[PDB]
Amino acid sequence: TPSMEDYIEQIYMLIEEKGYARVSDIAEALAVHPSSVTKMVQKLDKDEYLIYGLVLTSKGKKIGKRLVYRHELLEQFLRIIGVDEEKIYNDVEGIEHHLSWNSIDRIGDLVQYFEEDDARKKDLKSIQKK
Amino acid sequence: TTPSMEDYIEQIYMLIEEKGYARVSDIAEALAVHPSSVTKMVQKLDKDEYLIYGLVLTSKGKKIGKRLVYRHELLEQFLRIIGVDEEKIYNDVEGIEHHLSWNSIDRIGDLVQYFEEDDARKKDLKSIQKK
Ligand SMILES: [Mn+2]
Ligand SMILES: [Mn+2]
Ligand SMILES: [Mn+2]
Ligand SMILES: [Mn+2]
């Protein structure tokens, strides 16, 4: 689920940032109410992603790491092709849940393509001028 | 404009282009929804002046419809070009098309042109995929 993925992504980031994740911090991070959070935490607990402060299971840590990687990759991709920095976060937040792993992997190869030769970025920039 | 509303406009535009007209029953079939749901959305589109309730698109509806079909086709071409398995392309495009700003669409447009103007670039991309 897209929303469930947003939660796991955020929880993982808080644990890496503060060392733990409070219901209050999750609520403010997703701009939602603490009641909503608690309801999701129960489902995640039952699905074995975390125990409940709240601790992630090996399963939750694996998925969390993957989601943060996916988010970071997509921001890097949009940045490389020249998207206005101010529009990147909201676009990534919207598309990240609707891309298959096959698409993410191919975008990964695309980012690598442009990173291995700066002349390629200049050629892309040229077309943007025209 | 909402994502589902965009899905309706895109579909109506294509039916008019393919069959010459858009019936409520054909829209229901294409989106796999009940006709009541379609009728409700069509009244909202009528209210926002995208069409007149057969179904006739206004200049505003034709403009947006054309734009949405363009966006769908561009994104399919983009995923195809970078090597995504053909069977997964439609589903990915249907989901992301609504969440990309025009700025992103324009830049993806330049990217597609980039690979399309020199086959050598496509070969280099495929080479990395082999690493
Ligand atoms: Mn994200
Ligand atoms: Mn998101
Ligand atoms: Mn579409
Ligand atoms: Mn769609």
Swiss-Prot record, chain B:
Lineage summary: Bacteria, Bacillati, Bacillota, Bacilli, Bacillales
A single MF term (Gene Ontology): DNA-binding transcription factor activity
Keyword annotations of the record: Activator, Cadmium, Cytoplasm, DNA-binding, Manganese, Metal-binding, Repressor, Transcription, Transcription regulation
Name of the molecule in the record: HTH-type transcriptional regulator MntR
PROSITE patterns referenced in this protein's UniProt entry, alphabetically: HTH_DTXR
Regions that span the bilayer: none
GO cellular component term of the entry, any: cytoplasm
PANTHER family xref list: IRON (METAL) DEPENDENT REPRESSOR, DTXR FAMILY (PTHR33238), TRANSCRIPTIONAL REGULATOR MNTR (PTHR33238:SF11)
Protein's UniProt keywords contain Transcription regulation: yes
Organism superkingdom: Bacteria
Positions that bind Mn(2+) 1: 7, 94, 97-98
Activity regulation text: DNA binding is strongly activated by Mn(2+) and Cd(2+), but it is poorly activated by non-cognate metal cations, including Co(2+), Fe(2+), Ni(2+), Ca(2+) and Zn(2+). In the strict absence of divalent transition metal ions, MntR has a low affinity for DNA.
